[PDB]
Design a protein around this ligand. Structure first.
Ligand SMILES: CCCCCCCCCCCCCCCCCC(=O)OC[C@H](COP(=O)([O-])OCC(O)COP(=O)([O-])OC[C@@H](COC(=O)CCCCCCCCCCCCCCCCC)OC(=O)CCCCCCCCCCCCCCCCC)OC(=O)CCCCCCCCCCCCCCCCC
Ligand SMILES: CCCCCCCCCCCCCCCCCC(=O)OC[C@H](COP(=O)(O)OCCN)OC(=O)CCCCCCCCCCCCCCCCC
Ligand SMILES: CCCCCCCCCCCCCCCCCC(=O)OC[C@H](COP(=O)(O)OCCN)OC(=O)CCCCCCCCCCCCCCCCC
Ligand code: HEC
Ligand code: HEM
Ligand code: HEM
Ligand SMILES: COc1c(O)c(C)c(C/C=C(\C)CC/C=C(\C)CC/C=C(/C)CC/C=C(\C)CC/C=C(\C)CCC=C(C)C)c(O)c1OC
Lengths: 98, 41, 64, 24, 240, 369, 76, 43, 41
């Protein structure tokens, strides 16, 4: 299964652009909030990763495969921050519902 | 004073009174106006 | 005195042409044999015409 | 400091000296 | 539909920059004038159209003055006929389409001005139809005033076969074989349906030369103004 | 200067993503095509007469007696075709790269699409050929409060001069409303900025527009003009119908009735549904399903650059859109009908059902769902 | 608006003047490889729908013809 | 959709309902009168 | 190099060279193009 997941990871191709899964997530308020909560190091690094991708795209080129992020290499750095934001939102929403 | 509190204070009712009145006003206006025109000519 | 007919003449020689023509003959007798059939041979002929005409044109304006 | 890092060479992109500038 | 799609012919104007053969347009105009003008109309082609094309002002002039044209009731309510002018259009065969219906056994001969443009694969169709009055096969029977032309829709065209070999004599003397006549009238009708065919193709040639000059130069300007970015090298230097 | 400053802010110096491909040219091409159409339309309006006795005669007079009038007329017709080519590719770019999340821009877009289709329909009615009249009658009755509405539009029992003249007025006036709606379209977009093919936040890498995406738009304009002039000067009738070169005969019906090719996909759908009303509705939905599109986005990634299953579904959607375009052309007989029925079922099921389920599956594969 | 767009820090972006660099550096040198690289990452997602459109189109045409072709058994 | 339609929200639903009906009513009267819908006007 | 310093560096002169060239280009283009078209047909 995960083998195919890695194949799908390759399929996604953000590795070709060295894009962490979190990098790929389309920006959303919750995402933005989580991003805000991100420490500077992650933020700064995330920025360069994103910028790099765009440039590669501009030239219609991909990183050297070796530079490519491995399925294993990819990290869900923002995942936790997002989890918190979501839960909080859920809480407030429920409060409103009731 | 009753009218204000009943049909002219709530905007929704304000619209209701306007629309309904207009619906009938045409009948009255046309009728009255025609009477006048006919009398004139 | 028609180059076109001459073209058709050469076209006549074409084997594909005779094949289609043969089918037409079958149906003509076929229609005749079937006293009351609305089975026409436009179906067949059209086919013949297409090939014949298509080849005719291939060598028709050049001859013209 | 920043001095440590150096400018990458664009010679690959770089084409063929004010003498040439006028032409370029 | 149920008809032989006319086989394409190697026309002299079939090519991408290939113009019309104007001697063939002149011969086809002669074919129309002597044969096709008895039933078919050319309402959007005035005699002036001929001028400059296979015919000059004076050439058309004599051609226009060979016919007579009612020039209205003048000032005495006197409908009167006059010799055609370079400004006169081609004469009507019939004053109204119901006279065409009465004279052609209920069928209406259509305007041949845009026939080539109006008929799918017209040039071919025309040639085919005029040269496609083959005998009806067994099983099909046509009523009077009908002819089995495979190409014609239904294969039953009211028009009787109008081009018999040596139907008319070409003034140029080119043998008037049925075909030579059908090809000439197809070229002419084509010209009729597009008098600008030649002028356009010239424009198209100038357009291809100008685009072949201008596309790599504009591409070079774009690649100049986009090279700057396309060479930009980004480097991430966290202070670390 | 305030205005120039305004322009500078909007055109000369507007932050734009550095990595947008040639597809982002197409909308600017549409604007150019609009201007081209308007300009050519104005030079058709100085000689066209909207009278049923003289409309075909005026069109032939334009083609034969006005200096380069054939050029302006065939530029107008093939520019309408080029407008619909650029419109379809613009909508396909918006569908593929997730640009429909700009919801106000998308809704102003689908309003513009409806207006452009109505303008092209009435413009095709305008030359008053055989094909224009028969097509006209069909669509008006499509409206059949139905009977009244149809008769209203027709302006009489059946399309006749009454229609032609009001269709000339409406076909004249709607491209200026299209230009105003395009100004609103541009506004609702600059508030958010353009999207990029990766679908990510491109705020870290934005460049000016004057020297980078202007010369690119100029090159795209030049290529579009090359295709338009090779459509006009070399094959002026490959996209039109020959039967439009006959005058409008109410007594004679054509053996096969079509709209022009860009209406075909819709035509197929209409023909597919057995019920007349059903067809009309589905037809409308065909266009409207797009508006409905921003509420069907169930993925955490905006673009399809990193989404291969939805890429496959998108290209299957483009495939059966081409199939529906072909079917419309084909006549009513087996098996064209069944394909039409399936192709319509597959079109609505891919847009409505298959893409959000695929986006959920793709989110599950990245350990996001 | 340029400026106040987003927070970017600790990055160095180098570039060259247009006139200083070749206009088409290795244009066909790497362009071909890249274009080919590109086509092989997208051909399996793009092409097979249009392949089966071609098969359905041909099929429809031929089937339609056969449909039109007279039934020999009929009328006999 | 409880986020905007929770138990508390239902309360608001009923709270606003009357006003909503009034608005439809106004539009209804208008339609009848404006379009001279005669099926309703005749009564 | 001389040309740049003479007719292509000062924008005014840049325009001058463009306009003048265009004035003559038409003559040349039309002539050359026509030759080709005629040869073709
Ligand atoms: C293949 C052989 C040549 C080769 O290898 O070329 C590599 C080259 C790609 O090189 P790369 O380094 O991988 O990519 C960077 C680009 O060159 C960077 O350039 P680009 O491709 O981004 O340029 C912008 C884009 C701009 O394109 C547009 O604006 C197109 C607008 C839409 C099309 C027209 C509208 C109507 C459409 C109707 C359907 O232009 C093109 O795509 C090509 C323009 C060619 C102009 C004429 C040249 C002669 O291939 C091309 O450019 C393809 C076209 C030329 C061949
Ligand atoms: C056409 C085929 C173009 C092509 O090469 O397709 C592959 C390409 C992949 O694009 P992407 O994965 O974003 O990669 C970009 C840089 N690597 O794919 C693309 O170029 C993306 C396609 C964007 C727009 C495609 C438009 C298709 C036609 C749409 C018409 C109908 C759509 C709706 C109409 C209603
Ligand atoms: C299982 C995949 C095996 C792949 C083996 C090839 C070698 C892979 C390893 C080497 C790398 C080669 C280059 C890789 C390029 C990019 C990766 C790639 O191509 O991946 C395979 C691709 C995506 O795979 P995925 O989306 O996960 O598969 C789900 C299938 N639905 O999937 C595909 O490309 C498959 C696409 C199949 C599409 C079939 C569509 C059939 C139906 C079309 C209907 C059209 C309309 C018909 C008419 C309707 C109306 C009547
Ligand atoms: C000169 C050699 C020509 C050419 C090139 C054509 N014709 Fe005629 N024509 C006549 C009539 C009565 C009809 C209508 C018949 C019917 O509709 O049943 C026609 C029709 C045509 C067409 C149109 C075919 C179509 O598909 O609509 C064409 C392309 C055509 N013709 C070519 C009558 C006559 C004449 C009087 C006997 C003569 C002479 C011609 N036509 C001559 C020509
Ligand atoms: C306000 C600007 C416009 C004016 C004044 C205008 C005017 C006209 C006129 C007078 C005609 C009839 C002449 C002819 O037969 O070609 C016409 C035809 C047409 N117009 Fe327009 N038009 C305008 C904009 C557009 C636009 C934006 C479109 C595209 C949606 C369009 C599509 C068409 C089409 C398809 C035809 C039929 C062409 C044909 O005969 O094949 N027009 N227009
Ligand atoms: C009348 C024809 C249209 C014109 C003139 C037009 C004009 C434009 C222009 C100038 C742009 C900005 C440049 C670009 O990104 O390409 C644009 C972008 C856009 N248009 Fe349109 N448009 C038209 C039709 C449509 C339609 C029908 C839609 C809806 C499907 C639409 C939706 C969009 C979207 C979503 C964008 C944003 C592009 C992005 O950031 O990805 N447009 N349009
Ligand atoms: C974000 O970059 C821009 C942009 O800032 C503007 C104003 C326009 C609008 C420019 C035009 C020329 C509009 C199209 C032309 C018309 C005549 C309308 C763009 O098309 C565009 O590209 C995506």
């Amino acid at each position: 299964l995960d083998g195919f997941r890695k194949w799908y990871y390759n399929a996604a191709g953000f590795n070709k652009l060295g894009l962490m899964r979190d990098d790929t997530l389309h920006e959303t308020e919750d995402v933005k909030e989580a991003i805000r909560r991100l420490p500077e190091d992650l933020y700064n690094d995330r920025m360069f990763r994103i910028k790099r991708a765009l440039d590669l795209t501009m030239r219609h080129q991909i990183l050297p495969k070796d530079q490519w992020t491995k399925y294993e290499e990819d990290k869900f750095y923002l995942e936790p921050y997002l989890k918190e934001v979501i839960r909080e939102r859920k809480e407030r929403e429920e409060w409103a519902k009731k | 004073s009753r009218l204000y509190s009943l049909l002219f204070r709530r905007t929704s009712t304000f619209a209701l009174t306007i629309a309904v009145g207009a619906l009938f006003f045409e009948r009255a206006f046309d009728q009255g106006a025609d009477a006048i025109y006919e009398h004139i000519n | 005195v028609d180059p076109l007919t001459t073209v058709r003449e050469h076209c006549e020689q074409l084997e594909k042409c005779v094949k289609a023509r043969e089918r037409l003959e079958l149906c003509d007798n076929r229609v005749s044999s079937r006293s009351q059939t609305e089975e026409d041979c436009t179906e067949e002929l059209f086919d013949f015409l297409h090939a014949r005409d298509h080849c005719v044109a291939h060598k028709l304006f050049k001859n013209l | 400091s920043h001095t440590d890092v150096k400018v990458p060479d664009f010679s690959d992109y770089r084409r063929a000296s004010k003498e040439s500038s006028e032409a370029r | 539909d149920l008809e032989l799609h006319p086989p394409s012919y190697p026309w002299s104007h079939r090519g991408l920059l290939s113009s019309l053969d104007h001697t063939s347009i002149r011969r086809g105009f002669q074919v129309y004038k002597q044969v096709c003008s008895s039933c078919h109309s050319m309402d959007y082609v005035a005699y002036r159209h001929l001028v400059g094309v296979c015919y000059t002002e004076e050439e058309a002039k004599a051609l226009a003055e060979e016919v007579e044209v009612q020039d209205g009731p003048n000032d005495d309510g006197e409908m009167f006929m006059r010799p055609g002018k370079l400004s006169d259009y081609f004469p009507k065969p019939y004053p109204n389409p119901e006279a065409a219906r009465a004279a052609n056994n209920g069928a209406l001969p259509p305007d041949l001005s845009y026939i080539v443009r109006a008929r799918h694969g017209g040039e071919d169709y025309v040639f085919s139809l005029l040269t496609g009055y083959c005998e009806p096969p067994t099983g099909v029977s046509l009523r009077e005033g009908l002819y089995f032309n495979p190409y014609f829709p239904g294969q039953a065209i009211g028009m009787a076969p109008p081009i018999y070999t040596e139907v008319l004599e070409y003034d140029d003397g080119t043998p008037a074989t049925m075909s030579q006549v059908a090809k000439d009238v197809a070229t002419f009708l084509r010209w009729a349906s597009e008098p600008e065919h030649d002028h356009r193709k010239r424009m198209g040639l100038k357009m291809l030369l100008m685009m072949g000059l201008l596309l790599p130069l504009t591409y070079a300007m774009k690649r100049h103004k986009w090279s700057v970015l396309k060479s930009r090298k980004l480097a991430y230097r966290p202070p670390k | 200067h305030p205005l120039f400053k305004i322009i500078n802010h909007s055109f000369i110096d507007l932050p734009a993503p550095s990595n947008i491909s040639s597809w982002w040219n197409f909308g600017s091409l549409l604007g150019v095509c609009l201007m081209v159409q308007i300009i050519t339309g104005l030079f058709l309006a100085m000689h066209y007469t909207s009278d049923t006795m003289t409309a075909f005669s005026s069109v032939t007079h334009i083609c034969r007696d006005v200096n380069y009038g054939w050029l302006i007329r065939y530029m107008h017709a093939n520019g309408a075709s080029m407008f619909f080519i650029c419109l379809f590719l613009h909508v396909g770019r918006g569908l593929y790269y997730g640009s429909y999340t700009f919801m106000e821009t998308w809704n102003i877009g689908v309003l513009l699409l409806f207006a452009v289709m109505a303008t092209a329909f009435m413009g095709y009615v305008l030359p008053w050929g055989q094909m224009s009249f028969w097509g006209a009658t069909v669509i008006t009755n499509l409206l059949s409060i139905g009977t009244t509405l149809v008769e209203w539009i027709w302006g009489g029992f059946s399309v006749d001069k009454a229609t032609l003249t009001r269709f000339f007025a409406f076909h004249f006036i709607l491209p200026f409303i299209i230009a105003a709606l395009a100004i609103v379209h541009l506004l609702f977009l600059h508030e958010t900025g353009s999207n990029n093919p990766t679908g990510l936040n491109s705020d870290a890498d934005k460049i000016p527009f004057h020297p980078y995406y202007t010369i690119k738009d100029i090159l795209g304009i030049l290529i579009m003009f090359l295709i338009l002039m090779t459509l006009v000067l070399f094959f002026p009738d490959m996209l039109g119908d020959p039967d439009n070169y006959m005058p409008a005969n109410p007594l004679n019906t054509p053996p096969h009735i079509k709209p022009e090719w860009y209406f075909l996909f819709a035509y197929a759908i209409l023909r597919s549904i057995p019920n007349k009303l059903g067809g009309v509705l589905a037809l409308i939905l065909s266009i409207l399903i797009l508006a409905l599109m921003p509420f069907l986005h169930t993925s955490k990634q905006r673009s399809l650059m990193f989404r291969p299953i939805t890429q496959i579904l998108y290209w299957i959607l483009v495939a059966n859109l081409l199939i529906l375009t072909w079917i419309g052309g084909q006549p009513v007989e087996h098996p064209f009908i069944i394909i039409g029925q399936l192709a319509s079922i597959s079109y609505f099921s891919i847009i409505l059902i298959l893409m959000p389920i695929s986006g959920i599956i793709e989110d599950k594969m990245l350990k996001l769902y | 608006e340029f400026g106040n767009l987003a927070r970017i820090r600790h990055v160095i972006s180098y570039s060259l003047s247009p006139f200083e660099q070749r206009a088409f550096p290795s244009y066909f040198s790497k362009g071909i490889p890249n274009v080919l690289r590109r086509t092989r990452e997208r051909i399996l997602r793009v092409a097979p729908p249009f392949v089966v459109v071609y098969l359905i189109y041909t099929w429809g045409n031929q089937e339609f013809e056969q449909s039109k072709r007279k039934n020999p058994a009929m009328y006999e | 959709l409880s986020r905007f339609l929770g138990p508390r929200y239902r309360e608001l639903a009923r709270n606003w309902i009357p006003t909503a009906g009034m608005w439809g009513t106004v539009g209804a009267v208008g339609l009848v009168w404006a379009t001279d819908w005669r099926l309703i006007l005749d009564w």
